[PDB]
């Protein structure tokens, strides 16, 4: 593959600190606080 070809030549990708399931829990808090409390 190509993502593996880049890795073997010193080019690697670090993972983000917040997982996509942690960002999706931050969004729910904004949605749940807006509906039940407003601004």
């Amino acid at each position: 593959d190509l993502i593996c070809a880049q890795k073997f030549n010193g080019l690697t990708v670090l993972p983000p600190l917040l997982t996509d399931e942690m960002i999706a829990q931050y969004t729910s808090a904004l949605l749940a606080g807006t509906i039940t409390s407003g601004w």
């Binding site: 190509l2 070809a5 880049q6 073997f8 030549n9």
Partner: protein
């Protein structure tokens, strides 16, 4: 045959054809070889880093 490197030789699954000696990936790097004395196709993978 002078192709020097460091890697993990395995048994390659690539469908080499009688005229094909080496193999190359999408980045033009030697990805397979042919044994000079046994005519077996070996898949080369770099050691972990």
């Amino acid at each position: 045959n002078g192709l020097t490197g460091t890697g993990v030789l395995t048994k390659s699954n690539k469908k080499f054809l009688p005229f094909q000696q080496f193999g190359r990936d999408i980045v033009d790097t030697t990805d397979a070889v042919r044994d000079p004395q046994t005519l077996e196709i070996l898949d080369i993978t770099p050691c972990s880093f």
